[PDB]
Amino acid sequence: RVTLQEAPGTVPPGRLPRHREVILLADLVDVSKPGEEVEVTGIYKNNYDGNLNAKNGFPVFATIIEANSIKRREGNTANEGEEGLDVFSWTEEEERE
Amino acid sequence: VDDVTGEKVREAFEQFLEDFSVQSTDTGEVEKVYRAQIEFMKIYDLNTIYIDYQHLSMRENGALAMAISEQYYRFLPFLQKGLRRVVRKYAPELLNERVFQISFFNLPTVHRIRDIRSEKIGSLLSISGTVTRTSEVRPELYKASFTCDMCRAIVDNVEQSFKYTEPTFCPNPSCENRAFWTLNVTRSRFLDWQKVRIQENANEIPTGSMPRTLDVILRGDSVERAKPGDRCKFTGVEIVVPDVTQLGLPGVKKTTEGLNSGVTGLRSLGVRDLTYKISFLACHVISIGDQEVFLNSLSSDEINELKEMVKDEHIYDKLVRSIAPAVFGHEAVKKGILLQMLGGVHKSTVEGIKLRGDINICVVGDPSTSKSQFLKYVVGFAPRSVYTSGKASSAAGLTAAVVRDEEGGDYTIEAGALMLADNGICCIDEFDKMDISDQVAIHEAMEQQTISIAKAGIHATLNARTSILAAANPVGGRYNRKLSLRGNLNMTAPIMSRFDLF
Amino acid sequence: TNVSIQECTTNFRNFLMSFKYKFRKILDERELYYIKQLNEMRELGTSNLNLDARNLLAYKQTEDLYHQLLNYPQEVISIMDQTIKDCMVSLIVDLDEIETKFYKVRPYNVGSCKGMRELNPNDIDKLINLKGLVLRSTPVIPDMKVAFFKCNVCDHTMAVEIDRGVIQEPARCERIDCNEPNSMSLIHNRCSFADKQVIKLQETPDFVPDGQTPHSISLCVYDELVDSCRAGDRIEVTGTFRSIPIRANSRQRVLKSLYKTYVDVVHVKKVQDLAKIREVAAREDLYSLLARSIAPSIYELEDVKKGILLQLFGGTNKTFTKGGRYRGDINILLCGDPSTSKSQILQYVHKITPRGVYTSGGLTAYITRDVDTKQLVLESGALVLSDGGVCCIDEFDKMSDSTRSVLHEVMEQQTISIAKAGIITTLNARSSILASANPIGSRYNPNLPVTENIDLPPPLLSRFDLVYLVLDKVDEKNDRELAKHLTNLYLVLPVEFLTMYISYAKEHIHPIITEAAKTELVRAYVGMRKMGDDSRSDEKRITATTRQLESMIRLAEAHAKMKLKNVVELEDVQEAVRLIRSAIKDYATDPK
Amino acid sequence: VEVIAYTCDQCGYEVFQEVNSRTFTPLSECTSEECSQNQTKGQLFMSTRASKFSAFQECKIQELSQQVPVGHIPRSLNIHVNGTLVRSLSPGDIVDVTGIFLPAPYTGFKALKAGLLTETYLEAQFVRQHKKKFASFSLTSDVEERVMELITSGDVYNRLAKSIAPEIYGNLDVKKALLLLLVGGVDKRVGDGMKIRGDINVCLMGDPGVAKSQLLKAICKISPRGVYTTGKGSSGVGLTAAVMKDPVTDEMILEGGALVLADNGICCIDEFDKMDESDRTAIHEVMEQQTISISKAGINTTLNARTSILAAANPLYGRYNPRLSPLDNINLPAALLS
DNA sequence: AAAAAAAAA
Ligand SMILES: Nc1ncnc2c1ncn2[C@@H]1O[C@H](COP(=O)(O)OP(=O)(O)OP(=O)(O)O)[C@@H](O)[C@H]1O
Ligand SMILES: Nc1ncnc2c1ncn2[C@@H]1O[C@H](COP(=O)(O)OP(=O)(O)O)[C@@H](O)[C@H]1O
Ligand SMILES: Nc1ncnc2c1ncn2[C@@H]1O[C@H](COP(=O)(O)OP(=O)(O)O)[C@@H](O)[C@H]1O
Ligand SMILES: [Mg+2]
Ligand SMILES: [Zn+2]
Numbered sequence A: 001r002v003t004l005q006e007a008p009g010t011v012p013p014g015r016l017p018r019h020r021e022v023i024l025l026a027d028l029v030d031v032s033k034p035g036e037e038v039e040v041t042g043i044y045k046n047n048y049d050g051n052l053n054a055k056n057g058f059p060v061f062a063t064i065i066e067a068n069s070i071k072r073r074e075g076n077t078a079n080e081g082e083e084g085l086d087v088f089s090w091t092e093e094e095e096r097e
Numbered sequence B: 001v002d003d004v005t006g007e008k009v010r011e012a013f014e015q016f017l018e019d020f021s022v023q024s025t026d027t028g029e030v031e032k033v034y035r036a037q038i039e040f041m042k043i044y045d046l047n048t049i050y051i052d053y054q055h056l057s058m059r060e061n062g063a064l065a066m067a068i069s070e071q072y073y074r075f076l077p078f079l080q081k082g083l084r085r086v087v088r089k090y091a092p093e094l095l096n097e098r099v100f101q102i103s104f105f106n107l108p109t110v111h112r113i114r115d116i117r118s119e120k121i122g123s124l125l126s127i128s129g130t131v132t133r134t135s136e137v138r139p140e141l142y143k144a145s146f147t148c149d150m151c152r153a154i155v156d157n158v159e160q161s162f163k164y165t166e167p168t169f170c171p172n173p174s175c176e177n178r179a180f181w182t183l184n185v186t187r188s189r190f191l192d193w194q195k196v197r198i199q200e201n202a203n204e205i206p207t208g209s210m211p212r213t214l215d216v217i218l219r220g221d222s223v224e225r226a227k228p229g230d231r232c233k234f235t236g237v238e239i240v241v242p243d244v245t246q247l248g249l250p251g252v253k254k255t256t257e258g259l260n261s262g263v264t265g266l267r268s269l270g271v272r273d274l275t276y277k278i279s280f281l282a283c284h285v286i287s288i289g290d291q292e293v294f295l296n297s298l299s300s301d302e303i304n305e306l307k308e309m310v311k312d313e314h315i316y317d318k319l320v321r322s323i324a325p326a327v328f329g330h331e332a333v334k335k336g337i338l339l340q341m342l343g344g345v346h347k348s349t350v351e352g353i354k355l356r357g358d359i360n361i362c363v364v365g366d367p368s369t370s371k372s373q374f375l376k377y378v379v380g381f382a383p384r385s386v387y388t389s390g391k392a393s394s395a396a397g398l399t400a401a402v403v404r405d406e407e408g409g410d411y412t413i414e415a416g417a418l419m420l421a422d423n424g425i426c427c428i429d430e431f432d433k434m435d436i437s438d439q440v441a442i443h444e445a446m447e448q449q450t451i452s453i454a455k456a457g458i459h460a461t462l463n464a465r466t467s468i469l470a471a472a473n474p475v476g477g478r479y480n481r482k483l484s485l486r487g488n489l490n491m492t493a494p495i496m497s498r499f500d501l502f
Numbered sequence C: 001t002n003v004s005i006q007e008c009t010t011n012f013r014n015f016l017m018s019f020k021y022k023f024r025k026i027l028d029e030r031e032l033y034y035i036k037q038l039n040e041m042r043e044l045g046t047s048n049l050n051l052d053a054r055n056l057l058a059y060k061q062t063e064d065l066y067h068q069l070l071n072y073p074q075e076v077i078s079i080m081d082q083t084i085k086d087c088m089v090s091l092i093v094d095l096d097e098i099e100t101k102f103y104k105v106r107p108y109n110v111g112s113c114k115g116m117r118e119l120n121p122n123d124i125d126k127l128i129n130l131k132g133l134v135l136r137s138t139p140v141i142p143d144m145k146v147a148f149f150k151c152n153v154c155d156h157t158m159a160v161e162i163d164r165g166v167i168q169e170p171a172r173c174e175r176i177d178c179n180e181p182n183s184m185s186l187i188h189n190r191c192s193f194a195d196k197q198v199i200k201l202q203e204t205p206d207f208v209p210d211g212q213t214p215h216s217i218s219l220c221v222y223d224e225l226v227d228s229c230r231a232g233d234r235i236e237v238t239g240t241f242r243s244i245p246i247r248a249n250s251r252q253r254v255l256k257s258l259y260k261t262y263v264d265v266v267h268v269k270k271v272q273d274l275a276k277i278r279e280v281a282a283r284e285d286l287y288s289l290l291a292r293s294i295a296p297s298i299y300e301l302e303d304v305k306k307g308i309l310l311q312l313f314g315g316t317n318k319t320f321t322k323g324g325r326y327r328g329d330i331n332i333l334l335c336g337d338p339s340t341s342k343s344q345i346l347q348y349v350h351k352i353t354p355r356g357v358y359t360s361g362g363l364t365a366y367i368t369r370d371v372d373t374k375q376l377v378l379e380s381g382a383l384v385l386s387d388g389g390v391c392c393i394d395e396f397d398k399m400s401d402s403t404r405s406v407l408h409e410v411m412e413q414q415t416i417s418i419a420k421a422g423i424i425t426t427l428n429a430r431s432s433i434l435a436s437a438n439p440i441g442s443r444y445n446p447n448l449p450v451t452e453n454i455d456l457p458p459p460l461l462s463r464f465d466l467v468y469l470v471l472d473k474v475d476e477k478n479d480r481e482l483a484k485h486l487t488n489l490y491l492v493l494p495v496e497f498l499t500m501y502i503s504y505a506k507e508h509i510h511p512i513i514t515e516a517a518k519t520e521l522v523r524a525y526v527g528m529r530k531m532g533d534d535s536r537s538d539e540k541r542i543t544a545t546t547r548q549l550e551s552m553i554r555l556a557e558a559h560a561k562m563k564l565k566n567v568v569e570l571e572d573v574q575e576a577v578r579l580i581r582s583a584i585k586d587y588a589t590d591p592k
Numbered sequence D: 001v002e003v004i005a006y007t008c009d010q011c012g013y014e015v016f017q018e019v020n021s022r023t024f025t026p027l028s029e030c031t032s033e034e035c036s037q038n039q040t041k042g043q044l045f046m047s048t049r050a051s052k053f054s055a056f057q058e059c060k061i062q063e064l065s066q067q068v069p070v071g072h073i074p075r076s077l078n079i080h081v082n083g084t085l086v087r088s089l090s091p092g093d094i095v096d097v098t099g100i101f102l103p104a105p106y107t108g109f110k111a112l113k114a115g116l117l118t119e120t121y122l123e124a125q126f127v128r129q130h131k132k133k134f135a136s137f138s139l140t141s142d143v144e145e146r147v148m149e150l151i152t153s154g155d156v157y158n159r160l161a162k163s164i165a166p167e168i169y170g171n172l173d174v175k176k177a178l179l180l181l182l183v184g185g186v187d188k189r190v191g192d193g194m195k196i197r198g199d200i201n202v203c204l205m206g207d208p209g210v211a212k213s214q215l216l217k218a219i220c221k222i223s224p225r226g227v228y229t230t231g232k233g234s235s236g237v238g239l240t241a242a243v244m245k246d247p248v249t250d251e252m253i254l255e256g257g258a259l260v261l262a263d264n265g266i267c268c269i270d271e272f273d274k275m276d277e278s279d280r281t282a283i284h285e286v287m288e289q290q291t292i293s294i295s296k297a298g299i300n301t302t303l304n305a306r307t308s309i310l311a312a313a314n315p316l317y318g319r320y321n322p323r324l325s326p327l328d329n330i331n332l333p334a335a336l337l338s
Numbered sequence E: 001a002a003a004a005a006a007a008a009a
């Protein structure tokens, strides 16, 4: 599990970022690295919490994101030529070419 | 027990909802403003309704308006029932069963924070202050559905309170709810929730005393509507919140002087004392501080004035004359400012190379020849513009800076004037006395339209798409006609090439 | 006890209807207060009584009630309030305004003021008087008075009274038709509450002779006493003493052997004139007297006093839409060797002016971490606090470097913005600046120009409205005059009248300039332009700037603001031009 | 509390309870006969008027520097005082208390540890204040004949100067100046309220090895109001009071801007060129009996500073020079010097 | 409470 903030390039200027929690199951372990901007496709879910209810005094629930796909987006902002989780991967026909 | 008073106020409420029948203008014989509002909710799938207090005021005088305003919490469900009744009388398909919300606005008066007193609990009120902090938009349980585990019966529509409440009985005769219930997440209905903090303005507060603080809770469509630092007016109902920690919970459990108004003697409290604190609930927030898309905003003046301006023959000759009428002379400076404000096209190559599409202008002159007036006018006219001095007192300076708490895990950046001026005009004054860090960051921010930093384990590339306008003073005070721009100014040669006009 | 219930009420009622302060007058040895005050209440509609103990002490039957009040405060006060509730109706013989209002007393001067350094446990539940300084207040604390329950099964509600905070919960709904025991649920937001507030108080510093530390005593107030005191207030209070056990561990029923002490109070005290204005306003030489009234001890220095008084009067402010607002503030700087008593004038103007902050060489808003409570609060600076007044700055030379730019922001725009911790906003200042500076070295050498000696940026000096120089040079006559004057002091002045006159000038009076003065202004501008060049093509310094123009217009308008006029005259513009050019004539360096 | 009483809600006798331990527990049901009946009659409540109280105060005592064996840190000892002996002792004096040495349970900390270890304290019975008494020059016959002897002694100031510090030789001018300082100048205001301060501000200049520090120690010892400070070394001496974050509750008791006994005190400083900007600004605030008005958290409890200033320092070269003398001065701003 | 690393003046 990992903490996900907002990208400074998309936050409104002079404001504060928002944090969420991301859960990585098997085959997704150590794919992400600290300091690396990423894009995660996942499922949004909610669960109960006690201390969170105690501090706010209202029936509030915590939210987490379980990852289903991860795409690195560090440096290479050009993301229109082709689609996919990775743009540096080749098929057999591309190797033949 | 039938609370007939609630039924009576609900009947009057639905009556003036259905047949208000006010007239706005001469051509507006009968408007039926709330019927038109319901039509709007039909055609756009909205859920909230807005009611003016003044329009409510003259209906039955104080027999209805005061009856609703004073005991707002007492009669809220009756108003909800009446609204649901009229909506399902006039638009059943709108219900496809949904949380209707009502927001009252245009109250006669607004109260200060220091005038908040306990006798107004449950009464409609309006307050104002400076918002200083917000919170994340967390989901909130509103109507829970439960399953009796040993018999798998369904008990739903369980209204909640300031604690997470489970049912108390199982309708199945053979079962007697000895076991507890399992919450059905996919059957429950959640609602938005955000808590903001407000304090007294600098105007009201006397002497050197500390400001008074209050906590406001938003709900529904009014989330993220009060950004920090903005002075806003809130409309809602006074409430009181106890300490849930003393209350029974599944989880485990100035101030040291005590003397709080503790209350004890209940079943669930045991030997614990219950305290209370004042909090405000809000329902209405306001703040007091493509060419075809534009053509879609159609009006008689929109067509006529724009067509006349387009079809004229001496627009330009007039246009420059209309910029900064206060200043005297300086025609070319006005034309240059107009050209800057129009701006240039922005294009990108096929391989991802960006081309700068902005105009940068510098103004040089001897002291007191009305150079700051243009800066002030363009700040007051051009949207999303920021006025800034050349020497900045903050650590952000011009571009950005990194700040971290002492032994604190913040490692966050703070935005400089160039960062705030995104998609706008930055107006720096007194360009001469900039320092080396800014003096070398600017000619990267200008040409490449981006700012990059890598310090103490955090790296980022911030967007700084700005159109800069600057002013300066020649070395020695007065411009020496004998020499040239390079001789008089102390700016570096690469900076001069950055600018487009002088 | 069961003694004061019967006869004390009748005795104090008799002396309520039969009191006269002539008894106190005779006791002093140099009139029916209660009935006339009750009639004043009847014609006013308020609910409030004041009651002094010494007048209560002057009567022989009442001093027994005095002693019984000392022993048993609560019962005596309650029966007194009931007696007054009856007395209103007994005296009116509209009965409708009485049944809505209550009645309370505010006794005072029961005994001598006692300090926190001498409070024996023998004085528990007795009336004492305290003087002190308020340290901190607290937000209003709701207090339970009436409970609101509901039988959730049958949706039936009942109201339950409480006593001593402890509430006896009903174990079953009163409706025997359902009669279920566990169907009763409390409703938090449909009850009734009272507003309790806790005040922290510190002893006055006069009780500590040997450099010890002061002590703090907690206070409690109710209803009308809420928010009656703020931070730094010096008050005197009258109330009873109290003790309370400490819960210690909130999980158990164990109690500490020591009781916390706090005081519950019922009393607090702190520590058509326009006709007179126009009589003064019609005097011909009011200008000189008004200028010389501000500084009674300062010898000579008439022109600077006139300038300071005029800038205290202030100019006009306008915010026309198509052009924007124009500055109405006047800023003055004082320079000279540290032998002029120039700080005394700063203190004079600070205390004379209605609003103003006196600081030294942080001054603006900054986000702060609250000390006692772990929260974040935005706090405004000294400059913001002087909106509409005069901000006094001392030791202007040692201004550091980061704050100076802030001033460069606050004079040319009069609006300071802050962007920290996610908070972006703009704040209004609209303040006047009056500062003093010292030259570098033991003396200010006349040969060197002003810029080097003061060590200030040329633009910051340039953007001031005026500047004054003082040069104390050794001569026989002036030294003799100062010696005589100071020795005579060592061996015609108005009152706060000045303050209310200034307020009236500020906010009732909005004078304007006339067409006639425009010609004189243009002629003066040309005249100071014509001096700026001579018979040589050397291109002499341009001394006639538009800053001079704004200076004369503002000064002339402020002169018309004085004397309660509505349109300017020539005398205003001659006074303004003479005042500015006197300072300019002393601005020359060693050449020329 | 000594005896705690409960009112019984008109149910006859009011039940009493007695506790000597530091932890107390209340009652729930009472032995009233109608309350002892098979159903309750009123809940018992504690009555403050009927119960008996006693004044309580606690202190701690430190070992003297003489009695500590070498290489050791002095220890402490708590002490409890009850009754009429309350407020019979003040911080900063040498006393010899007689009392009872008693144990105190460790269960108050509630750690379930220290199965046999317990804390101990002393209970006061009788105290001799000892030390000395200033007596506020209370008039008495003996000192009256003493001042008669002084009057018969004739000229006195030279003798007093000779009698201050015989250990240091000569230097009669500085001793005469100190004597004139000890009395004070003209004070108590003038007409119209103009401020005049009776304290004299004198500074001593000299190279190291002149025993100006020794004379300063002598004048501080002989003057009851003397206080010695210096640049840092101790932080709670300048710009802050001694009650910062002191109480166990961390109540943050504070006056704001204040110095050490600045009212009618004799501030003595060695190495007057050493202190940082904070203490120098403090002196610039105390100039000419000016009140201290430094605020941090909305406090404005200004301390009325009226003190004489004693400053001893040297030029940073440590010696005098034949060249221009203001170049040496004090290496301090001339405004303070004037 | 005390040691040690980092960015800005
Ligand atoms: N005139 C003197 N008579 C007697 N002792 C003297 C004299 N001058 C100096 N001393 C000796 O000097 C010592 C104390 O002087 P000290 O060095 O503290 O003076 P200082 O000028 O304040 O210097 P520093 O700042 O270096 O401490 C003592 O041992 C004292 O005996
Ligand atoms: N219409 C105008 N024509 C010429 N000068 C003007 C006009 N309006 C204002 N001014 C003057 O121009 C000045 C603008 O400031 P600026 O040009 O930046 O000089 P400085 O650098 O000395 O502040 C103002 O002080 C004002 O007196
Ligand atoms: N003309 C005068 N009349 C009365 N007192 C004076 C005069 N000139 C100087 N003084 C005295 O000399 C002192 C001058 O100090 P000042 O120059 O105000 O200090 P600062 O360096 O704070 O400006 C004053 O305290 C004042 O008592
Ligand atoms: Mg020494
Ligand atoms: Zn079941």
Ligand SMILES: [Zn+2]
Pocket (backbone or CB within 6 Å): C151, C153, C154, C155, C156, C173, C174, C175, C178, C179, C180, C183
């Ligand atoms: Zn029922």
Ligand SMILES: [Zn+2]
Pocket (backbone or CB within 6 Å): D008, D009, D010, D011, D032, D035, D041, D042, D043
């Ligand atoms: Zn009983």
